[PDB]
Structures are given as C-alpha cells and as structure tokens.
mmCIF file of C-alpha atoms and ligand atoms in Angstrom:
data_model
loop_
_atom_site.group_PDB
_atom_site.id
_atom_site.type_symbol
_atom_site.label_atom_id
_atom_site.label_comp_id
_atom_site.label_asym_id
_atom_site.label_seq_id
_atom_site.Cartn_x
_atom_site.Cartn_y
_atom_site.Cartn_z
ATOM 1 C CA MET A 1 106.416 128.415 79.757
ATOM 2 C CA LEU A 2 106.323 129.482 83.315
ATOM 3 C CA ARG A 3 105.412 133.108 82.930
ATOM 4 C CA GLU A 4 101.836 132.076 81.319
ATOM 5 C CA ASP A 5 101.320 129.424 83.966
ATOM 6 C CA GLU A 6 102.163 131.957 86.382
ATOM 7 C CA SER A 7 99.705 134.446 84.920
ATOM 8 C CA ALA A 8 96.939 131.692 84.838
ATOM 9 C CA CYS A 9 97.399 130.732 88.423
ATOM 10 C CA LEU A 10 97.647 134.239 89.854
ATOM 11 C CA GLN A 11 94.728 135.265 88.017
ATOM 12 C CA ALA A 12 92.419 132.075 88.765
ATOM 13 C CA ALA A 13 93.589 132.813 92.503
ATOM 14 C CA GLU A 14 91.913 136.402 92.322
ATOM 15 C CA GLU A 15 88.646 134.667 91.316
ATOM 16 C CA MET A 16 88.650 132.927 94.689
ATOM 17 C CA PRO A 17 86.702 134.229 97.675
ATOM 18 C CA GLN A 18 88.338 136.434 100.491
ATOM 19 C CA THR A 19 87.306 133.904 103.178
ATOM 20 C CA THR A 20 88.352 130.167 102.213
ATOM 21 C CA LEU A 21 88.393 127.293 104.622
ATOM 22 C CA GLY A 22 91.639 125.596 104.615
ATOM 23 C CA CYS A 23 94.651 126.824 102.367
ATOM 24 C CA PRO A 24 94.118 129.149 99.479
ATOM 25 C CA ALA A 25 95.276 128.640 95.962
ATOM 26 C CA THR A 26 99.138 129.666 95.674
ATOM 27 C CA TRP A 27 101.722 130.153 92.951
ATOM 28 C CA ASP A 28 105.194 129.016 94.313
ATOM 29 C CA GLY A 29 107.530 130.022 91.425
ATOM 30 C CA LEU A 30 106.813 126.595 89.533
ATOM 31 C CA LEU A 31 103.543 125.234 90.268
ATOM 32 C CA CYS A 32 99.917 126.510 90.914
ATOM 33 C CA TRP A 33 98.675 124.838 94.187
ATOM 34 C CA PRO A 34 94.871 124.496 94.258
ATOM 35 C CA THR A 35 92.937 125.283 97.197
ATOM 36 C CA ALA A 36 92.615 122.636 99.671
ATOM 37 C CA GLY A 37 90.687 121.962 102.949
ATOM 38 C CA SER A 38 92.588 121.501 106.407
ATOM 39 C CA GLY A 39 94.000 118.010 106.732
ATOM 40 C CA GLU A 40 94.188 117.363 103.010
ATOM 41 C CA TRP A 41 97.356 117.185 100.988
ATOM 42 C CA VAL A 42 97.685 118.166 97.187
ATOM 43 C CA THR A 43 100.126 115.867 94.786
ATOM 44 C CA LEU A 44 100.960 117.494 91.648
ATOM 45 C CA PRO A 45 103.259 116.396 88.893
ATOM 46 C CA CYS A 46 106.386 118.362 88.143
ATOM 47 C CA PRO A 47 105.907 121.483 85.746
ATOM 48 C CA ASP A 48 105.683 120.488 81.885
ATOM 49 C CA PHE A 49 109.379 121.334 81.277
ATOM 50 C CA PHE A 50 110.115 117.959 83.087
ATOM 51 C CA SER A 51 109.232 115.842 80.039
ATOM 52 C CA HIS A 52 112.432 117.161 78.402
ATOM 53 C CA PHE A 53 114.315 115.535 81.255
ATOM 54 C CA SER A 54 112.227 112.542 82.553
ATOM 55 C CA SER A 55 109.488 110.019 81.157
ATOM 56 C CA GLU A 56 108.004 110.331 84.750
ATOM 57 C CA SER A 57 105.572 112.868 85.659
ATOM 58 C CA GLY A 58 107.127 113.665 88.865
ATOM 59 C CA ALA A 59 105.390 114.033 92.337
ATOM 60 C CA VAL A 60 105.594 117.369 94.530
ATOM 61 C CA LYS A 61 103.234 117.518 97.529
ATOM 62 C CA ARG A 62 102.033 120.268 99.985
ATOM 63 C CA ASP A 63 99.852 119.553 103.158
ATOM 64 C CA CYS A 64 97.346 122.033 104.055
ATOM 65 C CA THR A 65 97.450 122.013 107.902
ATOM 66 C CA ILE A 66 95.628 124.281 110.385
ATOM 67 C CA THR A 67 98.651 126.644 110.566
ATOM 68 C CA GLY A 68 98.935 126.961 106.762
ATOM 69 C CA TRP A 69 100.343 125.268 103.921
ATOM 70 C CA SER A 70 103.547 123.245 104.538
ATOM 71 C CA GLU A 71 106.563 123.567 102.260
ATOM 72 C CA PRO A 72 106.453 121.537 98.877
ATOM 73 C CA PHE A 73 107.786 118.147 99.573
ATOM 74 C CA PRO A 74 110.376 116.822 98.544
ATOM 75 C CA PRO A 75 112.263 119.921 97.694
ATOM 76 C CA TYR A 76 112.305 120.839 93.990
ATOM 77 C CA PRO A 77 115.922 119.798 93.334
ATOM 78 C CA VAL A 78 114.691 116.271 94.352
ATOM 79 C CA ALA A 79 111.232 116.066 93.092
ATOM 80 C CA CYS A 80 112.150 117.714 89.531
ATOM 81 C CA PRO A 81 115.834 117.187 89.025
ATOM 82 C CA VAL A 82 117.528 118.918 86.033
ATOM 83 C CA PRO A 83 120.322 117.349 84.200
ATOM 84 C CA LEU A 84 123.854 117.959 86.133
ATOM 85 C CA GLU A 85 125.243 119.523 82.876
ATOM 86 C CA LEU A 86 123.005 122.362 83.664
ATOM 87 C CA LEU A 87 124.310 122.705 87.065
ATOM 88 C CA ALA A 88 127.991 122.553 85.661
ATOM 89 C CA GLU A 89 128.157 119.012 87.300
ATOM 90 C CA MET B 1 93.534 92.640 116.900
ATOM 91 C CA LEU B 2 95.675 95.870 117.318
ATOM 92 C CA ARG B 3 98.093 94.040 119.676
ATOM 93 C CA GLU B 4 98.543 91.438 116.813
ATOM 94 C CA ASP B 5 99.309 94.265 114.324
ATOM 95 C CA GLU B 6 101.755 95.543 116.773
ATOM 96 C CA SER B 7 103.398 92.426 117.357
ATOM 97 C CA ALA B 8 103.772 91.563 113.607
ATOM 98 C CA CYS B 9 105.008 94.823 112.685
ATOM 99 C CA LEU B 10 107.577 94.590 115.587
ATOM 100 C CA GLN B 11 108.706 91.081 114.474
ATOM 101 C CA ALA B 12 109.022 92.553 111.046
ATOM 102 C CA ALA B 13 110.876 95.506 112.158
ATOM 103 C CA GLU B 14 113.534 93.597 114.145
ATOM 104 C CA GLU B 15 114.383 91.853 110.883
ATOM 105 C CA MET B 16 115.678 94.757 109.168
ATOM 106 C CA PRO B 17 119.276 95.811 108.590
ATOM 107 C CA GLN B 18 121.074 97.651 111.281
ATOM 108 C CA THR B 19 122.163 100.722 109.175
ATOM 109 C CA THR B 20 119.699 103.408 108.541
ATOM 110 C CA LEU B 21 119.252 104.441 104.996
ATOM 111 C CA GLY B 22 116.063 106.344 104.880
ATOM 112 C CA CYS B 23 113.273 106.051 107.711
ATOM 113 C CA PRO B 24 113.176 102.761 109.247
ATOM 114 C CA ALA B 25 109.792 100.938 109.481
ATOM 115 C CA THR B 26 107.935 101.723 112.647
ATOM 116 C CA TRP B 27 104.896 101.079 114.702
ATOM 117 C CA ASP B 28 103.214 104.128 116.086
ATOM 118 C CA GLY B 29 100.381 102.189 117.910
ATOM 119 C CA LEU B 30 97.773 101.973 115.162
ATOM 120 C CA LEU B 31 99.941 101.577 111.787
ATOM 121 C CA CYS B 32 102.790 99.698 110.749
ATOM 122 C CA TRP B 33 104.936 102.289 108.594
ATOM 123 C CA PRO B 34 107.175 100.489 106.132
ATOM 124 C CA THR B 35 110.785 101.650 105.476
ATOM 125 C CA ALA B 36 111.011 104.669 102.986
ATOM 126 C CA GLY B 37 113.661 106.505 101.273
ATOM 127 C CA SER B 38 114.428 110.176 102.107
ATOM 128 C CA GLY B 39 112.092 112.586 100.178
ATOM 129 C CA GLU B 40 109.557 109.932 99.834
ATOM 130 C CA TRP B 41 106.261 109.698 101.348
ATOM 131 C CA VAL B 42 103.899 106.855 102.379
ATOM 132 C CA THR B 43 100.092 106.750 102.501
ATOM 133 C CA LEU B 44 98.472 104.088 104.439
ATOM 134 C CA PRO B 45 94.622 103.306 104.752
ATOM 135 C CA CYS B 46 93.038 103.489 108.189
ATOM 136 C CA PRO B 47 93.476 100.514 110.391
ATOM 137 C CA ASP B 48 90.864 97.573 109.817
ATOM 138 C CA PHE B 49 88.703 98.631 112.638
ATOM 139 C CA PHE B 50 87.692 101.735 110.553
ATOM 140 C CA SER B 51 85.809 99.323 108.235
ATOM 141 C CA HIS B 52 83.258 99.361 111.036
ATOM 142 C CA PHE B 53 82.688 103.080 110.923
ATOM 143 C CA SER B 54 82.987 103.755 107.224
ATOM 144 C CA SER B 55 82.933 102.376 103.847
ATOM 145 C CA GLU B 56 85.976 104.312 103.041
ATOM 146 C CA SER B 57 89.699 103.208 103.334
ATOM 147 C CA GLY B 58 90.676 106.448 104.915
ATOM 148 C CA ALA B 59 94.173 107.718 104.127
ATOM 149 C CA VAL B 60 96.974 108.604 106.419
ATOM 150 C CA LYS B 61 100.669 110.051 105.395
ATOM 151 C CA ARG B 62 104.061 110.234 106.765
ATOM 152 C CA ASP B 63 106.771 111.895 105.097
ATOM 153 C CA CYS B 64 110.461 110.219 105.268
ATOM 154 C CA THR B 65 112.831 113.378 105.405
ATOM 155 C CA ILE B 66 116.349 113.626 105.952
ATOM 156 C CA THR B 67 115.722 114.280 109.355
ATOM 157 C CA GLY B 68 113.503 111.601 110.072
ATOM 158 C CA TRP B 69 109.833 110.620 109.871
ATOM 159 C CA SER B 70 107.211 113.556 110.155
ATOM 160 C CA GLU B 71 104.140 112.860 112.156
ATOM 161 C CA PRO B 72 101.064 111.284 110.834
ATOM 162 C CA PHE B 73 98.975 113.527 108.778
ATOM 163 C CA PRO B 74 96.317 114.425 109.256
ATOM 164 C CA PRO B 75 96.047 113.423 112.918
ATOM 165 C CA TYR B 76 94.448 110.236 113.497
ATOM 166 C CA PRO B 77 91.201 111.867 114.865
ATOM 167 C CA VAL B 78 90.777 113.511 111.710
ATOM 168 C CA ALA B 79 92.091 110.906 109.307
ATOM 169 C CA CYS B 80 90.297 107.892 111.089
ATOM 170 C CA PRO B 81 87.456 109.534 113.221
ATOM 171 C CA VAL B 82 85.365 107.462 115.435
ATOM 172 C CA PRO B 83 81.628 107.780 116.067
ATOM 173 C CA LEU B 84 80.649 110.856 118.433
ATOM 174 C CA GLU B 85 78.614 108.399 120.388
ATOM 175 C CA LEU B 86 81.857 106.499 121.461
ATOM 176 C CA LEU B 87 83.339 109.832 122.939
ATOM 177 C CA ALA B 88 79.923 110.712 124.377
ATOM 178 C CA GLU B 89 80.356 114.041 122.572
HETATM 179 MG MG1 LIG C 101 105.896 125.414 79.876
HETATM 180 MG MG1 LIG C 102 108.427 121.848 76.297
HETATM 181 MG MG1 LIG C 103 92.535 94.168 113.829
#
C-alpha cells in the first residue's frame, strides 16, 4: 500500500546527509526516487499496484540535471495506465 | 568515420514515411537517433571513437515527447568525455 511506501521513503530520505551531490531522494506521491548524481537518470518500474493491471513492470524515469530533478517521464497516465472502467471510460 | 555515420543515418532517414507519428529518426552530428513513439525514450552508446578513450559503452538518452525530441542527456562532454590532454586542459 502507498501510505507505507510513503512512510518508508520519507523516513529513509531523513537518513540522508544535508549536503548531497546531485539530486536527493524524493517521494513524488507514487514512487521513491533514489538519490542520484548530476547527469544520471533513474528508471523505476511502476508501483506494485500495477501487477493487478499489467504483466509488465512499467518504466518511469527522472533525469538528475544540474538544475534539479526533471519531472517523471512519461507522465503517470502513460507510464502506469489504469483500466478505463476506473476512469469511467 | 563520423561523416560515414552521418551519411548512412541521413540516407536511412530519407527513406522514412512523410507523416510524423512520434519523433523522427535524426542525426545530431554524433549519433543516429532512431524513430521513437511519444512517451518513449531511447538510450544509445557513445559513438565508436569513444572505444579509444574508455572500455565503457557510455550511454546517452533522448526523450520522445509529444512536443518533440528532448536534448541529448547528459550533454555529450559529460556523457562521452574526451581526454583532457586533447583540450589542453
Ligand atoms: Mg502497495
Ligand atoms: Mg496488491
Ligand atoms: Mg567511426
């Protein structure tokens, strides 16, 4: 469940140093992004609820640039699509 | 030769359909980027020459976004760095 993942992420995140190089670890509502260095990107699978909707693990990515993290790509509607009957489509 | 990679990429690129679905194959001066769908990204190794500087492939990403291709990431001098002697640095 997402509340527990959230609590794991946000607590781990507290154990990180105040000064990191690159991009610090971050919870974005759905996924815990691990710390990364400038010029690295991190690819994660969809959260675990996605196995009820797909055999594929999915792929979501964030680039760690020198101005900070990029937005997750592709957007979550695209990266981790839910059944249309849950959208009322 | 990089002029031979360029040529072969371009001759491949001129054989593609006229209509743009996704982001078209493109030659950025170092790499031949294949066609990609919206919301996909492509990762390529560094060009062949990099094999003189490192026993790594290196890795360079572009994102195919609904507004087009993003820039190569990380930027080439980070992604595929050249010996500092070459730049008398
Ligand atoms: Mg869960
Ligand atoms: Mg479950
Ligand atoms: Mg060559």
